[PDB]
Write a protein that binds this ligand. Structure first.
Ligand SMILES: *[C@@H]1O[C@H](CO)[C@@H](O[C@@H]2O[C@H](CO)[C@@H](O)[C@H](O)[C@H]2NC(C)=O)[C@H](O)[C@H]1NC(C)=O
Ligand SMILES: *[C@@H]1O[C@H](CO)[C@@H](O[C@@H]2O[C@H](CO)[C@@H](O)[C@H](O)[C@H]2NC(C)=O)[C@H](O)[C@H]1NC(C)=O
Ligand SMILES: *[C@@H]1O[C@H](CO)[C@@H](O)[C@H](O)[C@H]1NC(C)=O
Ligand SMILES: [Ca+2]
Ligand SMILES: [Zn+2]
Lengths: 114, 130
């Protein structure tokens, strides 16, 4: 619930209401930023959290943070870009691109019909 | 299929289609007049099959459109067949027919901007004399 304009690498406005320590707006699900000094999670006001290499805190420790299964956006401009619409499967994308450039299996865009 | 979006392609297969054509309306032409080699000029079906000269004319009539100019390859290829078979009268009639076609090419273009070149790939062991 950060205030408008808050730096993307900054802290959230008021502290945790559980352990009275602050937290960054950015947080990972898992990954190496999970840091627990003792049995407590790390008071971040000490360390340089807008540093280049600062690792935001996560829920689960891992060598490496993981991917996510959510969906992703497709941004499209140019000829036939509107064929890229709605929720689709990922393999749909090059089929549009091929169709519109008149390459691949379907050369329908370059048919003499209209 | 590989032709640009708003262009006219035909495919013709007989002599009637070849002279029906309007060369102001055909961007891509494909014409395959026999299953294999075409008929010797002295054997040709006046009706279903065009002479070499007929094909050269509407070929130039199409290719004259492009304002950058054109390149055209013409092969009187059945002279080789005629000599290979030993049948001089066919081989010599094929050569005369390509000559006719060379005469046509001269009236449809001008020597000011067209370089044309007549040659042969090789010869035969054809002689004449006594
Ligand atoms: C997290 O660390 C900060 C900074 O070390 C703590 O804030 C200071 O707290 C002490 C005493 O609690 C005060 O005397 C200081 O004035 C505070 N500010 C600074 C800039 O030092 C904070 O209390 C710590 N939180 C927890 C839960 O340990
Ligand atoms: C030359 O080719 C044309 C077209 O390929 C032939 O025209 C066909 O004529 C028949 C009737 O005899 C029609 O049913 C077909 O629909 C026509 N074809 C097309 C593609 O429209 C013509 O008969 C041929 N002529 C010779 C002498 O072979
Ligand atoms: C071709 O047409 C001429 C008409 O003058 C005819 O004499 C000749 O026999 C014909 N030959 C063939 C093979 O069609
Ligand atoms: Ca034929
Ligand atoms: Zn040969």
């Amino acid at each position: 619930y950060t205030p408008r304009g808050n730096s993307i690498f900054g802290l959230a406005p008021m502290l945790s209401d559980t352990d009275k320590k602050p937290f960054t707006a950015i947080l990972y699900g898992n990954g190496p930023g999970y840091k627990v000094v003792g049995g407590e999670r790390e008071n971040v006001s000490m360390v340089d959290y807008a540093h280049n290499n600062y690792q935001a805190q996560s829920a689960v420790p891992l060598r490496h943070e993981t991917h996510g299964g959510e969906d992703v956006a497709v941004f499209s401009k140019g000829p036939m870009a509107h064929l890229l619409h709605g929720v689709h499967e990922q393999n749909y994308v090059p089929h549009v691109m091929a169709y519109a450039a008149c390459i691949g299996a379907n050369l329908g865009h370059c048919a003499p019909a209209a | 299929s590989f032709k640009p979006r708003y262009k006219h392609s035909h495919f013709i297969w007989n002599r009637t289609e070849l002279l029906t054509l309007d060369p102001h309306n055909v961007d891509y032409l494909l014409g395959l007049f026999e299953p294999g080699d075409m008929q010797y000029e002295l054997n040709r079906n006046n009706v279903t099959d065009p002479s070499l000269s007929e094909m050269v004319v509407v070929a130039i009539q199409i290719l004259r459109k492009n304002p950058k100019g054109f390149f055209l390859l013409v092969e009187g290829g059945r002279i080789d067949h005629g000599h290979h078979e030993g049948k001089a009268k066919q081989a010599l009639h094929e050569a005369v027919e390509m000559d006719r076609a060379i005469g046509q090419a001269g009236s449809l273009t001008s020597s000011e901007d067209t370089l044309t070149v007549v040659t042969a790939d090789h010869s035969h062991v054809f002689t004449f004399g006594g």
